[PDB]
Structure 1
Amino acid sequence: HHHFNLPPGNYKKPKLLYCSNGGHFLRILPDGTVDGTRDRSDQHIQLQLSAESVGEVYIKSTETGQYLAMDTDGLLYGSQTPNEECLFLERLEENHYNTYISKKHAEKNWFVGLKKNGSVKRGPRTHYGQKAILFLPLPV
């Protein structure tokens, strides 16, 4: 369903997922809530990515051990255990950024995305060409 242009990074270290849309870092709160924060000091923005298959990743909270996931209704949530909803297709975009597509809902083009106000976008509201879907992985 999608291209195979991969980003040049690795999973050796944890990262911050910076969204240029509103300038927020992806955050997974202890209660499972998912959103964005501009506070670089936040303890819930440190994420550990790992590869399942080439270009297939898990995005986990280093702080809580929770996995980023997208539900049946396109909502992002923090999962205690890895499941099919936790896999994302990590790709290069605009020859620079990182995008994350819901593997489970790949055919629907549901991406991980942050609005300018720091709220997460619902899968069906996302789409190729948006700024909300563009992330820059930063060192922690």
Structure 2
Amino acid sequence: PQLKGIVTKLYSRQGYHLQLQADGTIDGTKDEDSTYTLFNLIPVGLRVVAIQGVQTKLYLAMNSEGYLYTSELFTPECKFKESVFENYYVTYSSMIYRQQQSGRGWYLGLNKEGEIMKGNHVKKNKPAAHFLPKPLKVAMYKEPSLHDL
């Protein structure tokens, strides 16, 4: 009910700011000033976060096929493991889905055109998976109510 999180923008190493538009579409934009680039990064576990669009209140999520989508309710598919990369970047990966052969994780990523990619196509060591967080402020959050899939 009282977790300390952060209000922040997520700047893709690919040159685009992550965005969650009112209609639920997820992509990257250069309109840094867009209110749809603001997210609540709420800890829901050890280096596990929920990524919620501030304006829409929607959570980013990844399904079993690797597609990213927006969820009104906080569910297991809304949890992302946060990992630091090359000191300044962070990567976000699914907590429940990964490659059945190597165990390689599925990640949040934007291509060079600033388009959202399938989680299983995004590799941890590639720029597509790297985000430079640009914090606005620290804030307190009610621990999101967890709902089964």
Confirm or deny: 8 A CA contact 2:94 2:107 kept in the other structure.
yes
Which has the greater radius of gyration? 2
Shift of 1:99: 0.5
Structure with bigger strand share is 2
The answer to whether the aligner puts 1:75 opposite 2:67 as a matched pair is: yes
Q: Provide the residue aligned with 1:127 in structure 2.
A: 123
Other-structure match for 1:36: 28
- Structure 2 CA distance, aligned partners of 1:30 and 1:84? 22
- Once the two structures are TM-superposed, the CA of residue 104 in structure 1 deviates from its matched residue by 1.5
2:106 counterpart of 1:110: yes
Query: CA-to-partner distance for each residue in 1:16-56, whole Å, 9 max, x for gaps?
Result: 000011x1111111222111111111121100011111111
Deviations 1:79-105 (Å, cap 9, x if unpaired)?
101011100000111222111011121
TM-score, normalised relative to structure 1:
0.86
SS at match of 2:106: coil
Equivalent of residue 25 in structure 1, options 17, 41, 45: 17
User: For structure 2, which runs of at least 5 residues remain unmatched after alignment?
Assistant: 137-149
Which of 2, 6, 12 is residue 13 of structure 1 equivalent to?
Answer: 6
* Alignment: residue pair count: 129
RMSD of aligned alpha carbons: 1.3
2:99 is aligned with 1:97: no
Partner of 1:58: 50
The one-letter amino acid paired with 2:10 is: L
One-letter amino acid of the counterpart of residue 53, structure 2? S
Runs of 4+ in structure 1 deviating by more than 4 angstroms, as ranges, are none
Q: Are residue 138 (structure 1) and residue 134 (structure 2) matched? A: yes
**Deviations 1:95-138 (Å, cap 9, x if unpaired)?**
22111011121444100001110101111111121010000110
Alpha-carbon distance, 1:139 to partner:
2.7
Q: For structure 1, which runs of at least 5 residues remain unmatched after alignment?
A: 1-10
* Residue type at the aligned position of 2:80: F
